[PDB]
Amino acid sequence: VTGDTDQPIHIESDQQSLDMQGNVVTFTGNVIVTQGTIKINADKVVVTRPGGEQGKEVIDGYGKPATFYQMQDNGKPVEGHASQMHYELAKDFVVLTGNAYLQQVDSNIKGDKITYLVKEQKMQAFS
């Protein structure tokens, strides 16, 4: 949605490690990256701030598959998965690489208990 890319970025993971020079942080173990309604799930996420300039950070996520989610202004969520997620903050887009897939949702329902009919009968034969 409008404003997502103005939101702070939140990362949660089991493990976290920094390199000595200090410009690369690695997250492993059920990593969740959120920014507004954007959500990325991955097994490993590397966050590079090249040259230490704020605003030029690069987020790389890897999983089998890594997953992507964002709500759109028209109210329809977008969901996808791929082996790699590439998100350059200075750009306005993400890149899905490796068996990449993307979908749009036009209807959903939530509750404590949902009953769904699995039997459809578009045609019937009588003999």
Partner 1 sequence: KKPVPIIYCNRRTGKCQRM
**Distance separating alpha carbons of residues 111 and 59, to the nearest angstrom:** 34
The yes or no reply on residue 30 touching partner 1 (CB under 8 A) is yes
Largest Cα span, the chain: 78
Whether the CB-CB separation of 82 and 101 falls below 8 Å is answered with yes
The yes or no reply on residue 9 touching partner 1 (CB under 8 A) is yes
**Distance separating alpha carbons of residues 45 and 16, to the nearest angstrom:** 10
One residue of 20, 21, 52, 55 binding partner 1 per CB under 8 A:
55
**Distance separating alpha carbons of residues 71 and 27, to the nearest angstrom:** 25
Q: How many residues belong to the site for partner 1 (CB under 8 A)?
A: 22
The yes or no reply on residue 103 touching partner 1 (CB under 8 A) is no
The yes or no reply on residue 13 touching partner 1 (CB under 8 A) is yes
DSSP secondary-structure letter at 8?
P
The radius of gyration of the chain's CA atoms, rounded to the nearest angstrom, is 19
The yes or no reply on residue 97 touching partner 1 (CB under 8 A) is no
- For partner 1, the binding residues (CB under 8 A) are 5-14, 16, 25, 27, 29-30, 35, 47, 49, 54-55, 57, 89
Residues forming contacts to a second copy in the complex (CB under 8 A) are: 1-2, 4-5, 38, 68, 70, 72-73, 76-78, 80, 82, 87, 92-123
